[PDB]
Amino acid sequence: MIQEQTMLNVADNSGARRVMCIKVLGGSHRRYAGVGDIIKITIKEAIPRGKVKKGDVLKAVVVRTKKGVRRPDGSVIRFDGNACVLLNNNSEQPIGTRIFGPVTRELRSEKFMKIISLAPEVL
Amino acid sequence: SRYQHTKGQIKDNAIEALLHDPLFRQRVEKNKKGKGSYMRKGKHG
Amino acid sequence: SRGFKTEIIEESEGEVAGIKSVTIKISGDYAYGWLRTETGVHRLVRKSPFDSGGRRHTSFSSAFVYPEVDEINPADLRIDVYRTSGAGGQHVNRTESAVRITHIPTGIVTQCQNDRSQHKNKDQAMKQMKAKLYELEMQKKNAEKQAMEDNKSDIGWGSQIRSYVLDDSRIKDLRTGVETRNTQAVLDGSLDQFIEASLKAGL
RNA sequence: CGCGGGGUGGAGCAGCUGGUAGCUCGUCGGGCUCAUAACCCGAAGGUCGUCGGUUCAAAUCCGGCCCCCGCAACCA
RNA sequence: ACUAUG
RNA sequence: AGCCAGGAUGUUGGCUUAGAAGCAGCCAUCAUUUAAAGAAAGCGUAAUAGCUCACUGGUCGAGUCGGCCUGCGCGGAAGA
RNA sequence: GCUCAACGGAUAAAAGGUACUCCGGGGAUAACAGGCUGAUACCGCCCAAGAGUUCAUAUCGACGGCGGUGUUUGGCACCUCGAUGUCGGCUCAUCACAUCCUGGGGCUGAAGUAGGUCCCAAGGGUAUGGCUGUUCGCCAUUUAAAGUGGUACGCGAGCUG
RNA sequence: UACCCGCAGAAGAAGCACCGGCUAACUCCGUGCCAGCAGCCGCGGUAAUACGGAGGGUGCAAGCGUUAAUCGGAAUUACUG
Residue-wise DSSP of B5-37: -SS-S--S-SHHHHTTSTTS-------SSSSS-
Q: A49: Cβ under 7 Å from strand G?
A: no
Give residues with Cβ within 8 angstroms of A75, minimum separation 6.
none
Measure the CA angle with vertex C159, ends C50 and B28; round to 5°. 25
Closest chain B CA to residue C38:
B15
Å from C54 to nearest chain B CA?
8
Q: Kindly report the backbone phi and psi dihedral angles of residue C196, in degrees, each rounded to the nearest multiple of 5, phi listed first.
A: -65, -65
Method: cryo-EM
Å from C180 to nearest chain B CA?
24
Residue C100 CA to residue C118 CA, distance in Å, equals 11
Disruptive mutation site among C42, C48, C52, C60 for chain B (greatest number of B CBs within 10 Å): C60
Helix intervals (H) in A3-120: 113-118
Residue A45 CA to residue A14 CA, distance in Å, equals 12
Can you spell out the DSSP letters for A8-36?
A: EEE-B-SSBSEEEEEEE-SSSS---B-TT
- Environment class of residue A107 by beta-carbon count within 10 Å: exposed (0-12), middle (13-18) or buried (19+)? buried
Residue C78 CA to residue C94 CA, distance in Å, equals 22
> What CATH number is associated with residue A65?
2.40.150.20
Q: Which residues of C touch B (CB under 8 A)?
A: 39-41, 51-62, 64, 142, 145-146, 149-150, 152-154, 156-157, 159
Q: Which nucleotide is nearest to C114 (CA to C1')?
A: D73
Q: How far is CA A78 from CA A8, A22, A62, C19, C177, in A?
A: 15, 23, 14, 92, 90
Specify the number of domains making up chain A: 1
Q: Which of B15, B24, B28 sits opposite C64 (nearest CB)?
A: B15
Whether the Cβ atoms of residue A85 and residue A102 lie closer than 8 Å to each other? no
Binary contact (B15, C41; C-beta < 8 A)? yes
Residue C63 CA to residue C52 CA, distance in Å, equals 29
Binary contact (C59, B28; C-beta < 8 A)? no
Whether the Cβ atoms of residue A85 and residue A61 lie closer than 8 Å to each other? yes
Helix intervals (H) in chain A: 113-118
Amino acid symbol at C158: G
Q: B44: Cβ under 7 Å from strand H?
A: yes
Give the residue among A82, A2, B17 at the shortest CA–CA distance from C149.
B17
Q: A29: Cβ under 7 Å from strand G?
A: yes
User: Do the bridges between strand A18-24 and strand A38-43 make them parallel or antiparallel, or are there none, so unpaired?
Assistant: antiparallel
Q: C5: Cβ under 7 Å from strand G?
A: no
Note whether B28 contacts C: Cβ–Cβ < 8 A: yes
Q: What is the resolution of this structure in A?
A: 3.0
Whether the Cβ atoms of residue A86 and residue A62 lie closer than 8 Å to each other? no
Residue B41 CA to residue C12 CA, distance in Å, equals 46
Q: C88: Cβ under 7 Å from strand D?
A: yes
Find how far residue C192's CA is from the centre of its chain. 27
User: Do the bridges between strand A57-64 and strand A38-43 make them parallel or antiparallel, or are there none, so unpaired?
Assistant: antiparallel
Residue C116 CA to residue B38 CA, distance in Å, equals 85
Whether the Cβ atoms of residue A104 and residue A63 lie closer than 8 Å to each other? yes
Q: What domain range is A70 assigned to?
A: 1-123
> How many other CB atoms are found less than 10 A from the CB of residue C155?
15
Residue C105 CA to residue A62 CA, distance in Å, equals 43
Residue B2 CA to residue C150 CA, distance in Å, equals 11
Q: How far is CA A14 from CA A51, B3, B16, in A?
A: 6, 47, 56
C93 DSSP assignment: H
